């Protein structure tokens, strides 16, 4: 009975998204078990924020066009599905966008509140091709987990909304790609040990240390109802 | 003329109405045209039947 | 005999679910059978699933 | 006699008539589900005396 425990050792930020997390020592046969358990629970149960309703003035349904804007409104919605915010205190916020003049409209000039962090401020939303054109929008941002389409939400809710709220599908989870790797480690005379290396590719919104801690937490909580009772 | 676009009263009324969705409210006003225009504003701005 | 006629449009948005047909160019038909979470898809040696 | 297109339809609850303007035709942008009203029409019939 020579049980041995792992400890989180090294974190090496390759870039602002990619990240590699090392973790050792592990006795034989435990690289793969932990590796695959928390690969399966990082890709499905992380919490993050994403846009879920858009209101743009002077537009009634999402199939029209507008004066002096390159994209028609379906394209504006499909461009807004993929901006990455980070909300500190609340669980829902209303952001405001407002611009006029020729040029591309990027995500940089969302009129920031006090506690909303926008990750990439160079992500394009619209194109304005006339000197008199202007655009003004009100976005809502929420918090949740998993994947939730618009049909489910529209059929669940009894509340009434005006002619002009447009519903967007939501995709809350921040983790994009994940791949682990088991390697042979070096301890004084024990040549039997291992090491685990998880490489993680996400947008912003999650600092990797917190990701691994949340995964381990929910696994232990799941096992708890499985130890004591019988 | 678009008088219902900068008043404080209309804004206050919408704010009060939309946070108490389980109250029946009787709003009384001065004359007919004002009543119809208030109804239109509420219906097309906040969907309050 | 007709005085006036109005004419109203509608617009829906359909998407994939089981039972719904697809096919390649070479003549290999098929009928979707299951929509499978991301985890279960076979993943090659580098992380990217199929 | 002639038909008419109007919003004053006999024997309908006030609920279904929110979504019609004065002339009795749906708004643009209102989203409908099976069973609602699109155009309000009434057909005159026999006039019995009194």
From Swiss-Prot, chain C:
Signal peptide: none
Subunit and partners: The RNAP catalytic core consists of 2 alpha, 1 beta, 1 beta' and 1 omega subunit. When a sigma factor is associated with the core the holoenzyme is formed, which can initiate transcription.
Function: DNA-dependent RNA polymerase catalyzes the transcription of DNA into RNA using the four ribonucleoside triphosphates as substrates.
Family: Belongs to the RNA polymerase beta chain family.
This protein's name: DNA-directed RNA polymerase subunit beta
Source organism: Escherichia coli O157:H7
Taxonomic classification: Bacteria, Pseudomonadati, Pseudomonadota, Gammaproteobacteria, Enterobacterales
Positions spanned in the full protein: 1045 to 1094 of 1342
């Amino acid at each position: 009975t020579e049980f041995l425990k792992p400890r989180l050792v090294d974190i090496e930020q390759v870039s602002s998204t990619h990240a590699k997390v090392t973790l050792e020592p592990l006795e034989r046969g435990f690289g793969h078990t932990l590796g695959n358990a928390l690969r399966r629970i990082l890709l499905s149960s992380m919490p993050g924020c994403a846009v879920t309703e858009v209101e743009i003035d002077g537009v009634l349904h999402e199939y029209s066009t507008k004066e002096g804007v390159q994209e028609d409104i379906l394209e504006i919605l499909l461009n807004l599905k993929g901006l990455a915010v980070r909300v500190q205190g609340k669980d829902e916020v209303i952001l405001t966008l407002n611009k006029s003049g020729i040029g591309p409209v990027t995500a940089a000039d969302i009129t920031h509140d006090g506690d909303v962090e926008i990750v990439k401020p160079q992500h394009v939303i619209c194109h304005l091709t006339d000197e008199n054109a202007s655009i003004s929008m009100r976005i809502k941002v929420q918090r949740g987990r998993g994947y939730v389409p618009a049909s489910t939400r529209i059929h669940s809710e009894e509340d009434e909304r005006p002619i002009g709220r447009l519903l967007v599908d939501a995709c809350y989870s921040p983790v994009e790609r994940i791949a682990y790797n088991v390697e042979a480690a070096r301890v004084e005379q024990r040549t039997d040990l291992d090491k685990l290396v998880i490489e993680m590719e996400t947008n912003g919104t999650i600092d990797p240390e917190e990701a691994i801690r949340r995964a381990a937490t929910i696994l232990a909580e799941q096992l708890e109802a499985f130890v004591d009772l019988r | 003329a678009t008088w219902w676009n900068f008043d404080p009263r209309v804004e206050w009324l919408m704010g009060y109405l939309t946070s108490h969705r389980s109250q029946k409210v009787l709003v009384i006003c001065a004359k007919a045209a004002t009543a119809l225009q208030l109804e239109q504003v509420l219906r097309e701005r906040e969907g309050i039947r | 005999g007709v005085l006036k006629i109005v004419k109203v449009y509608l617009a829906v948005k359909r998407r994939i679910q089981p039972g719904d047909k697809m096919a390649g160019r070479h003549g290999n038909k098929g009928v979707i059978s299951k929509i499978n979470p991301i985890e279960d898809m076979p993943y090659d040696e580098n992380g990217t699933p199929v | 006699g002639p038909e008419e297109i109007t919003a004053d339809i006999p024997n309908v609850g006030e609920a279904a008539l929110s979504k019609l303007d004065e002339s009795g035709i749906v708004y643009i942008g209102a989203e409908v589900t099976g069973g609602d009203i699109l155009v309000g029409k009434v057909t005159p019939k026999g006039e019995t005396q009194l």
